[PDB]
Amino acid sequence: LNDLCFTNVYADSFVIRGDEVRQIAPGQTGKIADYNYKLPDDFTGCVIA
Amino acid sequence: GEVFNATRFASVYAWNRKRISNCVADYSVLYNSASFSTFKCYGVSPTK
């Protein structure tokens, strides 16, 4: 990613319970996935926890 | 109910099986009661 130039980037930062770290994956469903936040299946981006 | 929270689960060497049939199946009421960390499903999406 150091060798690519970006058109535009968005940074979404928020607090998650230790056990729910794998709920933000595309296609993955659950309580916070369905009622709080979920991202499109064809998502291009990197996650840092 | 009996498969999500029993007195004590049968060991892996003598794992418990029963046929379930002639009823209606839904996950919403009981999944959140016993909260889980590894749900990986192969043939079927949880919503379908």
Swiss-Prot record, chain B:
Result of altering residue 33 to F: In strain: Omicron/BA.2, Omicron/BA.2.12.1, Omicron/BA.2.75, Omicron/BA.4, Omicron/BA.5, Omicron/BQ.1.1, Omicron/XBB.1.5, Omicron/EG.5.1
Superkingdom, natural source: Viruses
Outcome, altering residue 1 to H: In strain: Omicron/BA.2.75, Omicron/XBB.1.5, Omicron/EG.5.1
Effect of residue 1 to D: In strain: Omicron/BA.1, Omicron/BA.2, Omicron/BA.2.12.1, Omicron/BA.4, Omicron/BA.5, Omicron/BQ.1.1
Positions bearing carbohydrate: 5
Annotated effect of mutating residue 38 to A: In strain: Omicron/BA.2, Omicron/BA.2.12.1, Omicron/BA.4, Omicron/BA.5, Omicron/BQ.1.1, Omicron/XBB.1.5, Omicron/EG.5.1
Phenotypic consequence of residue 8 to T: In strain: Omicron/BQ.1.1, Omicron/XBB.1.5, Omicron/EG.5.1
Variant or mutagenesis effect after changing residue 5 to Q: Reduced viral infectivity
Mutation effect (residue 33 to L): In strain: Omicron/BA.1
Assembly: Binds to host ACE2. RBD also interacts with the N-linked glycan on 'Asn-90' of ACE2. Cleavage of S generates a polybasic C-terminal sequence on S1 that binds to host Neuropilin-1 (NRP1) and Neuropilin-2 (NRP2) receptors. Interacts with host integrin alpha-5/beta-1 (ITGA5:ITGB1) and with ACE2 in complex with integrin alpha-5/beta-1 (ITGA5:ITGB1). May interact via cytoplasmic c-terminus with M protein. May interact (via N-terminus) with host bilirubin and biliverdin, thereby preventing antibody binding to the SARS-CoV-2 spike NTD via an allosteric mechanism.
Stated role: Attaches the virion to the cell membrane by interacting with host receptor, initiating the infection. The major receptor is host ACE2. When S2/S2' has been cleaved, binding to the receptor triggers direct fusion at the cell membrane. When S2/S2' has not been cleaved, binding to the receptor results in internalization of the virus by endocytosis using host TFRC and GRM2 and leading to fusion of the virion membrane with the host endosomal membrane. Alternatively, may use NRP1/NRP2 and integrin as entry receptors.
Name recorded for this polypeptide: Spike protein S1
Species, as recorded: Severe acute respiratory syndrome coronavirus 2
Residues of the full protein shown: 339 to 386 of 1273
